[PDB]
Design a binder for this molecule. Sequence first.
Ligand SMILES: OC[C@H]1O[C@H](OC[C@H]2O[C@H](O[C@H]3[C@H](O)[C@@H](O)[C@@H](O[C@H]4[C@H](O)[C@@H](O)[C@@H](O[C@H]5[C@H](O)[C@@H](O)[C@@H](O[C@H]6[C@H](O)[C@@H](O)[C@@H](O)O[C@@H]6CO)O[C@@H]5CO)O[C@@H]4CO)O[C@@H]3CO)[C@H](O)[C@@H](O)[C@@H]2O[C@H]2O[C@H](CO)[C@@H](O)[C@H](O)[C@H]2O)[C@H](O)[C@@H](O)[C@@H]1O
Ligand SMILES: OC[C@H]1O[C@H](O[C@H]2[C@H](O)[C@@H](O)[C@@H](O[C@H]3[C@H](O)[C@@H](O)[C@@H](O[C@H]4[C@H](O)[C@@H](O)[C@@H](O[C@H]5[C@H](O)[C@@H](O)[C@@H](O)O[C@@H]5CO)O[C@@H]4CO)O[C@@H]3CO)O[C@@H]2CO)[C@H](O)[C@@H](O)[C@@H]1O
Ligand SMILES: OC[C@H]1O[C@H](O[C@H]2[C@H](O)[C@@H](O)[C@@H](O[C@H]3[C@H](O)[C@@H](O)[C@@H](O[C@H]4[C@H](O)[C@@H](O)[C@@H](O[C@H]5[C@H](O)[C@@H](O)[C@@H](O)O[C@@H]5CO)O[C@@H]4CO)O[C@@H]3CO)O[C@@H]2CO)[C@H](O)[C@@H](O)[C@@H]1O
Ligand SMILES: [Ca+2]
Ligand SMILES: [Mn+2]
Length: 713
Amino acid sequence: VLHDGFNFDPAIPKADEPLTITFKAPEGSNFYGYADDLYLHSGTGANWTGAPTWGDNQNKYRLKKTKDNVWSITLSSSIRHFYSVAPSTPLQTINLIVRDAEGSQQTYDYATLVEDSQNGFIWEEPQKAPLPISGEEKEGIHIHSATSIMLVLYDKDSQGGHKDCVFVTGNFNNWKLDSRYMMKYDETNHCWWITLEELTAGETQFQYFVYSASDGGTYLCDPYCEQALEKGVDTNFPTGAQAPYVSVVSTNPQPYQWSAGEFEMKNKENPVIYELLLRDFTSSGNLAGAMEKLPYLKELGIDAIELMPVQEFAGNDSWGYNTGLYFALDASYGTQNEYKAFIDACHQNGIAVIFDVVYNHTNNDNPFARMYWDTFNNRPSTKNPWLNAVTPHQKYVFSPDDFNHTSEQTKAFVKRNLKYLLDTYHIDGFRFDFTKGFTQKQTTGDDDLAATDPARVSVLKEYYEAVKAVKEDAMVTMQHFCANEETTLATEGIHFWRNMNHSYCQSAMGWKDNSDFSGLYDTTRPNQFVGYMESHDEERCAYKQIEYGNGALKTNLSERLKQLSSNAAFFFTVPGPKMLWQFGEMGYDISIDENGRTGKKPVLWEYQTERKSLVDIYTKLITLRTTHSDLFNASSQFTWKVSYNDWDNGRTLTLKAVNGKQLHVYANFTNASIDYTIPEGTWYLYLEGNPVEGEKKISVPAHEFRLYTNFAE
Ligand SMILES: OC[C@H]1O[C@H](OC[C@H]2O[C@H](O[C@H]3[C@H](O)[C@@H](O)[C@@H](O[C@H]4[C@H](O)[C@@H](O)[C@@H](O[C@H]5[C@H](O)[C@@H](O)[C@@H](O[C@H]6[C@H](O)[C@@H](O)[C@@H](O)O[C@@H]6CO)O[C@@H]5CO)O[C@@H]4CO)O[C@@H]3CO)[C@H](O)[C@@H](O)[C@@H]2O[C@H]2O[C@H](CO)[C@@H](O)[C@H](O)[C@H]2O)[C@H](O)[C@@H](O)[C@@H]1O
Ligand SMILES: OC[C@H]1O[C@H](O[C@H]2[C@H](O)[C@@H](O)[C@@H](O[C@H]3[C@H](O)[C@@H](O)[C@@H](O[C@H]4[C@H](O)[C@@H](O)[C@@H](O[C@H]5[C@H](O)[C@@H](O)[C@@H](O)O[C@@H]5CO)O[C@@H]4CO)O[C@@H]3CO)O[C@@H]2CO)[C@H](O)[C@@H](O)[C@@H]1O
Ligand SMILES: OC[C@H]1O[C@H](O[C@H]2[C@H](O)[C@@H](O)[C@@H](O[C@H]3[C@H](O)[C@@H](O)[C@@H](O[C@H]4[C@H](O)[C@@H](O)[C@@H](O[C@H]5[C@H](O)[C@@H](O)[C@@H](O)O[C@@H]5CO)O[C@@H]4CO)O[C@@H]3CO)O[C@@H]2CO)[C@H](O)[C@@H](O)[C@@H]1O
Ligand SMILES: [Ca+2]
Ligand SMILES: [Mn+2]
């Protein structure tokens, strides 16, 4: 009798006996009805000792077809002799891939356990025992003492099944599988657990080996670790450990001393948000480099820094939209305490901190993925309780590992992670990446995906309410781009990205086509829409000038900075929260496609002095929202003429406070001077408080604006 996949004679592989491996292709699978022989790509232990060169078709690697959909191979003399393993090396796992002769079609990483009598690895029945703790955050790493930690690993698949055993391996047992480090299973709580005793204080490194007869075994780290080494990044990644991740825990942490107490976001109803990628914001690409620039951002007058994703992402050179671990921040930007110090410094400068967080998808490195994996199709198992096997929204497939947001396990994980980041890092709110992806509906395009999904609306409220329960003044922004759902969710106090990049690129270039600014201001709830001329996802307004500008806007820096300054006068002057992408204030004009869309960008701090005239305008316009905040109250009456038809005679905006304060802006986006009659009144050129007669007529040069207040300071 044969199960689907790999079968073993002897049933329990023995390191020092021969082994017959029989592979049975399951129905639908890619070798189902395959006619020819298959080949074995295999090796022992974490790093596949003795693996051949991919495609080596020596007879010793041939699996003979013995029946329909059944192939067999014998590892002769012994397993140890087959892989040339030394007699005193514990041989505890065998990793198996079957492939065609061409090395084109294949199965994916699988392992089984090997008993090594000769070296003292004898199998034992795993014990059942009750979890000795209770409560809502049972899973993960509990520091019991300087010398002991309890590990708790959730294990229940979507078919109600679980693994057969779990070993903990690490620096404490030289990365071996050992019967003393077998976790006990609690069937009521659906958790493996163990206490590691007799650790030396300092740093414990570990991973799990999880095993079932039906799934085989796999190495994975703890999803709740706060610190991880990643193989290919950390030079000290342990030799005995398998890629990708090793969990790190200190039983004696040096705990960060937070300054003073109580931080509140300034201008909290309508903040100016600076979107920052640590990788490209400074030459050092890290927190320490960014910390040197907090004085610059404070003077700029911003209310909040939005950090592009800092949760552990694949490798160390990324935008961050490829999260492998959610409770560990990426050590390429710095240590846990450097993240706290950076956030503390922001706070001490008056600046809030928002984390960009990515819950649509994770990657193949996530323990949640590795726990229940399909080794035939290289994607999450259909039994995976957190992840979809196949992305429901086929228009947008950013990784193989799409979260199921109708899973209770997924929802509990996201809420616990949002609470963790608020409690540990003292952050001020969240920008949720791609909330449109929090859906189980089968779709193939933009319109079917964008149609209302009441379950998507419902889970986004749940996530919002979970954040508010922890910090009632936390700012929750969602990158959604689904109009009907945004109306419902904006009513609850959720903020939404309002993408005005297209219009302000067109105006920056001097093209009136599709230049309508009006989408920046939602007339119903202007404070719920975070409007931007630029984001990390879009082309730079100052780059489009160079590539496609009308006339002098291609070549004349002076004129380009005037036009970008006029854009800003039609942006920071508008009620509701606003976002700028790093260096827009200094006319950053490298194409998004330079060095590839997500590639490292040039770091051009010399632009801060060479385009200081634009930095000054941004600073004054942003600072105006602090010094005259009563003007930008959403109660203020706001009117503007910013359509396709508002061009040859200028664009206008007037903002009128209930207390009688007024702001008026005129701009000429054209390539020629235009005559304008200032509206009636006594006006000051606030960016210069020198008075100006209203009902008076001026010539406004190409690309320039005039800003007027009916107050002098
Ligand atoms: O380490 C390897 C590698 O991994 C990474 O790559 C992952 C991807 O990252 C990036 O994509 C991100 C965005 O940055 C993020 O902001 C977010 O953006 C999504 C939106 O959430 C989603 O809604 C959708 O937007 C659509 C929109 O829905 C639709 O309605 C319309 O909207 C317009 C409208 O048409 C218009 O009228 C106007 O009103 O404005 C609207 C707003 O635009 O069109 C929108 C845009 O199409 O899509 C966007 C993204 O475009 O979420 C994603 C993912 O979290 C990168 O931009 C992307 O290139 C990366 O994918 C790359 O890598 C993948 C595998 O690794 C691969 O599958 C993919 O093909 C490949 O290109 C890291 O971040 C890298 O740094 C790293 O090296
Ligand atoms: O420090 C030791 C060592 O560590 C790292 O390599 C080890 C891996 O971390 C470990 O997983 C294991 O690698 C396995 C691999 O996981 C497994 O999938 C298989 O790899 C096959 C692919 O399956 C197969 O498709 C083919 O891959 C091609 C790929 O198709 C092609 O598109 C292109 O990208 O190149 C690939 C390479 O030929 O072949 C590979 C096998 O080559 O088997 C692997 C084991 O052989 O063990 C690795 C070695 O210990 C580090 O990456 C390595 O530098 C370090 O020396
Ligand atoms: O009346 C005759 C003429 O009128 C119209 O064309 C003129 C436009 O009205 C005018 O604004 C100006 O066009 C600008 C355009 O507004 C501006 O955006 C820029 O266009 C660039 C894009 O910015 C750039 O991204 C790229 O667009 C590509 C895109 O990358 C690609 O993926 C795909 O979508 O195709 C697009 C090209 O179709 O390149 C364009 C440049 O082609 O600069 C434009 C001017 O260079 O000038 C137009 C006349 O030159 C009508 O549109 C036209 O049909 C009539 O013939
Ligand atoms: Ca990383
Ligand atoms: Mn999704």
